[PDB]
């Protein structure tokens with residue numbers, strides 16, 4: 020099945036998911052001189068105070084933190100969105116070395132990792148129907164550079180040991196996603212897709228201009244995870260990012276001058 024190896028990585032994905040070569044694929048590079056400020060954009064509203072995290076899981080590709088979405092407890096609205104989107108899970112993409120790991124880039128600059136908070140449009144009722152609509156999902160992407168440690172990331176780092184291999188999960192309650200945001204909520208936005216198969220075109224991306232910093236010690240622990248299952252030959256979970264795709268007919272908008 021797909022993955023990030025030589026034989027089943029991103030340049031093979033199109034054979035099983037032809038949308039890989041579609042018109043609205045992600046990630047892309049953000050060319051800051053071709054992006055345009057849009058005064059019509061509103062400030063993002065992140066309301067995560069009643070978030071209820073439930074579990075963390077290694078899915079062989081990656082680790083996801085899952086949240087209860089059976090109600091409007093942790094939502095995103097405003098920004099370029101119409102309506103309310105509920106938080107369902109977050110996960111990261113990272114590299115084997117600090118000079119790579121992000122999926123988006125800025126002026127071709129790569130960051131060490133990138134966090135994706137995934138949300139779906141509650142007009143559609145459940146996540147499964149959201150992924151059949153052009154405005155079904157919203158993903159908030161945050162870059163990570165290596166520097167100072169991020170206190171709010173430490174509880175995640177500390178449970179990784181227990182979901183080392185594919186299929187392992189651990190109870191992960193009362194984690195507050197607010198500890199992962201940067202100081203500013205200025206952003207870029209563009210219509211795209213999920214970045215792992217099935218690659219569905221259902222996403223309004225909101226990529227925050229300010230990165231968060233993590234320590235070298237924190238990122239190191241993500242690289243000790245495994246793509247394989249328990250009792251199989253060890254393959255470290257590193258470089259699980261997809262290379263930038265063609266912008267094609269799309270415009271990137273910025274919320275800031």
Ligand SMILES: [Zn+2]
Nearest residue numbers: 110112135214
């Ligand atoms: Zn992602």
